[PDB]
Every structure is written in structure tokens, then in C-alpha cells.
Amino acid sequence: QKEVYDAAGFGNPVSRGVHPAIIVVDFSYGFTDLQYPTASDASLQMSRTKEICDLARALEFPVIFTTIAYHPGEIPMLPWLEKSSGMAALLYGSRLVEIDMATGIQPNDVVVVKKGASSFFGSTLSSLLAGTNTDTVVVTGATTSGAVRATVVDAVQSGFKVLVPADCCADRAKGPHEASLYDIQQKYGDVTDSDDILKWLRSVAG
Amino acid sequence: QKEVYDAAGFGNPVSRGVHPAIIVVDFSYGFTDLQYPTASDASLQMSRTKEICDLARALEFPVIFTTIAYHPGEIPMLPWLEKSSGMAALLYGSRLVEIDMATGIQPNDVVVVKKGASSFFGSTLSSLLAGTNTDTVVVTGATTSGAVRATVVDAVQSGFKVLVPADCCADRAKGPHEASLYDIQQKYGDVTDSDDILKWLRSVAG
């Protein structure tokens, strides 16, 4: 398998740019608080993302959070909600939608609302990144086999280099988790840890 | 794991609509002809996609083929080509970008050229689908864990119900293949076989 992917030209390292942005994907209570059946254990990974975000905010790099939120009228309109009926609980005005405070989200941090898995689809994220002259995005969040991968794929397609720290990704199952990190490492971006991005961000700032 | 995914609201069946369309993703020679390192065995899946496409074309349902092709100038402009370097061989005018004749492409079938994994990103696919009043898409092609998965996700996000026959999906490795078929069945669409879609297509035309 390793030989198959290497000959097909997968797994090459990405050369990092000099205008980073951090994207925090769906670290809302709906996905991080175990009282809701749609959530995973994200305690460790949220504290890792907190360190990254607190660094980037101090270094004046854009930090953008994303959440899934619906109006009651949108439920029958979106066929994704037929397949994943649990996402229908993610309603405007509810606690499920609010970003988890364990991330260290600051009032001036941009939150983008989305209706699908990918953070770029039907959202303003791409424009925010292009307007700030971003060349590299570090993707963090939940879930790794869900919204994270979908965001990762859409980010590379959109013209941005993708770094993903494994420290920072949470899923509800180990299998899907490893499969996505594998696919990303081969096809879409560099998989690393938080320790690498902390050092890298400091060196790009001077 | 099954209980975790059931509580989260995943795994539900999609109620199929009445305006079908077939999307054939990257069944070009670059992914089907084994003389190339980017390719994988797609013999059986092509002859089953041929069966589906013939029926749909006869019933006058939209049949759409998608392929990846690049201008030589586009190569340095796209960060995905840095990650998946082998995709840079897919140039305009080469044999790798031509749709494999084993699928039975007819001169009236639409070919959409794309620059990424997803058939929807930066392409007219959504406009074609919506313009023909499509409600349900059957997604086929290669690779399962690459462009197929990405197209499936985008299809649901774009407002279309999704059916993927495992019969018509080829990948370079079994692991990634099963892992994407798992995620699709839980989150994005119904994984079925070619025998079911053929039967289903006839009943909608009745």
C-alpha cells in the first residue's frame, strides 16, 4: 500500500507560507459536551487548540471559529439532516450552538455559521481568508472524520496550504479518526502535533 | 461504536426522489488504465456503471461524467498538486484525461472538467443538476476515498439526496475504500449495489 501511494505521488510535504490563519471547526457544546448524544470527548484537544489560538491572537493572525446552527424552517429543506438527524438539534438560540468556553474564544473572534459538514461550503470563510491574504491554514476541531476532513479538503481546493495537528482533532470513534488522518496526510495536508505549530507560528512572526 | 453513531442520529435511510441523475467521477484513463501509477483496477465497476448509464440515458435522465485536467500554467498555482504530485500528469490533450471508453460514453453525455477532488467545487455541476430539476444523484467512479467521497459530501451539502452503489466504486487500497463507504452510509448517503439502482430507475420511469 505504501508503495502504491508513493508511486501515485501521494504524501509529499507541504511548504508552509507566511500568513497563517487558524480555523477551529465545530468546537461547540453540541460536539464537546457529553450530555448531548452528538458529542465526543474533546477535553484534551480543546486545551491544545486554546494554546494555539492564544498564540495566534497575540501574534495578530486571524482566528476563525465555525459552528453548525439551524432555524426550524431549514430542517425539512436540507437532505443532510435526513441522513444525520441528530444535527437537527443544533438550533439557533440553543446552548448546543454556542462555542465551548474551554477553547478560550474571545468576543472579537469571528464565528461563521454553516449548514453542512465543510466550513467553506455556503459560508464566508473563503472570503475572510482571501481578504486577510492567508496562504496557510491550520485546521483544528471536531469531528476529524466529519467536519474537519471536509474543511481540510475544501481548504486545499480553495487555494490554501493545510496543516492539521492530531493533538487538536476529536472524533467519536478511533477507526474513522485514523482513516481520515491517513487520507489527509496522503492527499490534502500535513498531519502534525500542536508542538510543531506553536514553534512554527513563533518563527513566522519573528 | 454502533450505539454511539445511532445516538448521534446517524445511519438513517434516504427517501429517494423521482428526478434521478447519474454522476460518474474520474473514470478517465488516468485512474483506470493500470499502465499509469495513479490508476487502479476498475474493470468490473466500469461495466456496471455502463449498465446504469445506458438505462438512464434511455430514460432521458441526465448522465454526467467528471474528469480532472490541468493547463501547464495551473500546476504551480494549486497547493493540492504540491501534496498529490501525481495529479500533475493529468494535462489537457493527454490520454489520461480522456474518459475510459469501457463506460460507454455517448457524444451527448456531459463532461465536466474540474481541478480538485470534489466534482462540485469550482465546477458547473450544481447548476446542471438544479437546472434539470434533479433531486437524487447516483454517484459512481474512482477513487472511493478520494473524489467519490468528496463528491458525495458536496452533493448532500448542495441539496441532493445521494445513492452510491459499492459495485461502481474503485479505489487503490481496500482499507481507505471501506472507511469511506462506512462514513457515507452513516453521514451522507445510502450505500447500495448496481442491481438496486437499475431496479429503482425503472420504477421511477413507470
Side-chain angles (χ1 to χ4, degrees), chain A residues 1-2 4-45 47-196 198-206, chain B residues 1-2 4-45 47-100 102-185 187-196 198-206:
Chain A
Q1 193 181 136
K2 204 114 286 189
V4 180
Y5 276 87
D6 291 352
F10 291 111
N12 292 118
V14 49
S15 284
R16 310 176 178 182
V18 288
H19 303 272
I22 151 83
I23 306 161
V24 190
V25 192
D26 295 323
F27 266 155
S28 57
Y29 288 120
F31 300 104
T32 61
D33 188 340
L34 297 174
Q35 73 160 306
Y36 312 117
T38 63
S40 316
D41 185 8
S43 55
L44 289 173
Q45 26 270 297
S47 74
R48 302 284 73 79
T49 59
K50 181 153 156 51
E51 282 155 343
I52 296 167
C53 291
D54 284 21
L55 221 199
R57 211 177 295 105
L59 301 180
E60 284 187 309
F61 303 140
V63 179
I64 302 152
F65 295 83
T66 60
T67 193
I68 303 171
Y70 301 106
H71 281 254
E74 285 179 309
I75 314 292
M77 301 186 175
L78 295 163
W80 186 49
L81 271 18
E82 187 191 37
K83 251 287 168 199
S84 312
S85 54
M87 308 288 141
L90 288 287
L91 294 161
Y92 268 80
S94 78
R95 197 188 164 256
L96 289 285
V97 157
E98 296 299 303
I99 311 300
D100 198 316
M101 294 289 281
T103 63
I105 180 158
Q106 226 69 5
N108 208 238
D109 288 345
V110 176
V111 179
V112 331
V113 180
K114 62 188 180 74
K115 316 286 172 169
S118 174
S119 288
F120 287 80
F121 193 100
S123 83
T124 190
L125 179 53
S126 178
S127 299
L128 269 33
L129 265 25
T132 50
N133 274 70
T134 296
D135 54 30
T136 309
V137 291
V138 23
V139 183
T140 59
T143 64
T144 135
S145 64
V148 176
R149 189 219 260 250
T151 301
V152 166
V153 168
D154 265 9
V156 212
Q157 285 175 323
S158 294
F160 310 102
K161 292 155 182 296
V162 178
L163 299 167
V164 19
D167 264 325
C168 298
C169 300
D171 214 329
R172 49 182 74 87
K174 201 210 206 75
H177 178 84
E178 287 157 357
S180 272
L181 291 188
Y182 181 87
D183 285 13
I184 289 161
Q185 178 52 39
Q186 292 303 124
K187 307 182 182 189
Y188 310 112
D190 267 4
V191 183
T192 24
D193 52 30
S194 54
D195 273 348
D196 176 43
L198 288 294
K199 305 193 204 223
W200 174 70
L201 291 173
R202 294 176 218 271
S203 70
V204 312
Chain B
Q1 186 183 134
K2 220 214 91 181
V4 174
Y5 271 81
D6 277 26
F10 296 115
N12 304 79
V14 35
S15 64
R16 307 170 179 186
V18 291
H19 299 292
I22 323 293
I23 299 165
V24 185
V25 357
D26 296 307
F27 267 166
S28 62
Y29 289 109
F31 301 97
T32 58
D33 202 308
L34 298 97
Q35 76 173 256
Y36 308 121
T38 54
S40 51
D41 190 15
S43 287
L44 293 178
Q45 27 274 295
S47 69
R48 292 202 198 100
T49 306
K50 194 181 185 292
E51 280 152 34
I52 297 170
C53 288
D54 291 345
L55 217 211
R57 199 184 294 106
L59 301 173
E60 281 160 330
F61 296 144
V63 177
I64 304 166
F65 293 85
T66 61
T67 187
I68 302 170
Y70 301 109
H71 270 254
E74 288 175 318
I75 314 291
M77 299 190 180
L78 289 163
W80 190 44
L81 272 8
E82 194 191 48
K83 234 303 165 198
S84 312
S85 60
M87 311 298 285
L90 300 269
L91 268 10
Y92 278 101
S94 72
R95 197 186 166 257
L96 338 196
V97 67
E98 306 291 328
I99 316 291
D100 196 314
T103 55
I105 334 102
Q106 230 59 30
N108 195 233
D109 299 331
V110 174
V111 182
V112 264
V113 193
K114 63 200 181 75
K115 315 284 172 182
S118 175
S119 292
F120 286 82
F121 190 85
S123 89
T124 186
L125 184 53
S126 184
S127 294
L128 266 21
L129 258 31
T132 46
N133 212 14
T134 301
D135 59 16
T136 324
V137 291
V138 6
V139 175
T140 66
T143 57
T144 310
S145 62
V148 172
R149 197 206 195 268
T151 300
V152 166
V153 172
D154 260 14
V156 222
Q157 282 178 319
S158 300
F160 308 107
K161 296 150 178 284
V162 180
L163 302 164
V164 11
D167 283 10
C168 315
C169 290
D171 212 324
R172 48 181 70 85
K174 189 198 269 77
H177 171 87
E178 292 175 342
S180 274
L181 286 184
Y182 178 74
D183 291 348
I184 292 166
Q185 179 52 42
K187 297 176 177 186
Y188 308 113
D190 263 30
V191 175
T192 186
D193 56 28
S194 61
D195 286 309
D196 174 37
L198 285 167
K199 185 179 166 67
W200 171 66
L201 286 166
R202 296 177 186 274
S203 63
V204 10

